[PDB]
Each structure stands twice: as C-alpha cells, then as structure tokens.
C-alpha cells in the first residue's frame, strides 16, 4: 500500500495473508468470509504470463496478522488449504476480467479479537454504496512504493472513481466486473495498492447497518500511486452468484 498508514490492532480482522511455503514469502492478500472460506484474486493463484499456477499444498493462509514478517504467536492462526476454486471465466490472458478465487480451509478457523469475517454485499448495499466519490478502504502488506516494505499491515481509504474516468485513464479494456478507485491529480491526497496487495479487500462500512462489506478485491493497476492512474478492483457483488454457487456446492 502506497501512502497509507499502519493499521490499528484488530482494524481489519478479516485480513488474510496468502503465504508461500517454499520459499517462505508473501504471495498476496485475501479475506475471511466465513470460518472455512477465504476470498482472493484469481491472479494470486493462476497467472501464466508469470509462470504462476499454485496448487493447494504450495500455500498457507495466515489469519489474524498485523506484523508482516513476524510469527505472531498466540494471535495469528495458520490454515492449510483443502481446495482452490478459480472463477471459470477468469481472464488471465487479457485484462484480469473476473479476477476472483475462493479457498476452502481444511479446518474451521477459530474467531477471536483478531479474526472475524467480513460481510459480502447484497444487491441493495452494492447499489447504495458503489457510487463515485464514496470511499472504501484497502489493506495489505504489499510494497510501500512502486520502485520499501512495511513492518505492519497498511491501510488506505480511497474514493470510487467515475467509470468514464477509469476508462480514460488506461488502454486496458475495463469491464463491468471491475471498478476503480483513487484520488485524482487535482485532489491532492494520494494512495494506492501495490505489488503484494493483490487479492486483499476493498471494504466499505455500511451507514445503514454499521457493518463492513467487501465490495472489491485488489486486482490491477499501472504502476502504484501514479498521477492519473487508478487501482482496479474486482466487483465482488457482480460475481456473488459464482461465490454462492461454489459455497453451496462445496461447503
């Protein structure tokens, strides 16, 4: 995360770290959506242009974390993966359309002060909140700059951007399964996701029921925190029928 700040303790208890077993390193962010299911970006697991194609045994999920690098004894919980599910129409070839994947854990994770699921939006919450200018919150342990790495989880609040502005900022083809967020050059304030933040959540706190909802997944951007560029996020609600189908079938 570029131009964010250190998270407060327990600020993002749905935050998940996708951790490579060997070599031991950060792979991506992710989020906890129930005691057995974790949501992330498909490109965290499958991205052939970079020779990425992980299997379950390659990976761990680390839940309840704050420190990036420390083993947070008695706080974090480490889970093995039972199964990965990638959206069947995930477009790794072109533009990361439908950049979403689910991971089922081998065993349920115990909730705690540091570990708690985020809500997924309903159609109405999505309609109400996914509006230009409305701010969400992005969290992760990714790089602090495009060209270093944080001690603890970082957080940044960013406004959703008008779709034509998103479109006009890039040559990449944008789809309805994406939205973009970030400040405009004339807005002064800054901030973006960056490498290593992929797969983490873009959340919004509903002013109707005071619950946090995950509206987006950190997906793609051209550089990090560049003027006139924006970060692109998977539109979770648009893909929720797939999420539900997977959980209903395999839960």
């Amino acid at each position: 995360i570029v131009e964010g700040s250190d998270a407060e303790i327990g600020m993002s208890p749905w935050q998940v770290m996708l951790f490579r077993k060997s070599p031991q390193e950060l792979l991506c962010g992710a989020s906890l959506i129930s005691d057995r299911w974790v949501l992330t970006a498909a490109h965290c697991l499958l991205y052939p242009p970079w020779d990425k194609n992980f299997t379950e045994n390659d990976l761990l999920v680390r839940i309840g974390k704050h420190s990036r690098t420390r083993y947070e004894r008695n706080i974090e919980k480490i889970s093995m993966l039972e199964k990965i599910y990638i959206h069947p129409r995930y477009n790794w070839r072109e533009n990361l359309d439908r950049d979403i994947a689910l991971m089922k854990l081998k065993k349920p994770v115990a909730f705690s002060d540091y570990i708690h699921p985020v809500c997924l939006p309903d159609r109405e919450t999505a309609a109400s909140l996914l509006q230009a200018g409305y701010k969400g919150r992005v969290t992760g342990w990714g790089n602090l700059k495009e060209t270093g790495q944080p001690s603890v989880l970082q957080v940044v609040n960013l406004p959703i951007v008008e779709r034509p502005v998103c479109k006009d900022s890039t040559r990449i083809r944008i789809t309805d399964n994406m939205f973009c967020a970030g400040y405009k050059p004339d807005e002064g304030k800054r901030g973006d996701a960056c490498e290593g933040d992929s797969g983490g959540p873009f959340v919004m706190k509903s002013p109707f029921n005071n619950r946090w909802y995950q509206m987006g997944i950190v997906s793609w951007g051209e550089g990090c925190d560049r003027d006139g560029k924006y970060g692109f996020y998977t539109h979770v609600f648009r893909l929720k029928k797939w999420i539900q189908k997977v959980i209903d079938q395999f839960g």
């Binding site: 031991q24 390193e25 761990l60 680390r62 690098t69 420390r70 083993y71 480490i78």
Partner: peptide
C-alpha cells in the same frame, strides 16, 4: 525475511 513458522504447519 520472514520469521520461521512452527513446523506443524509445514508438514
């Protein structure tokens, strides 16, 4: 760069 995690998670 990462602190080693318990072996139980790497079996």
């Amino acid at each position: 760069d990462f602190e080693e995690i318990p072996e139980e998670y790497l079996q």
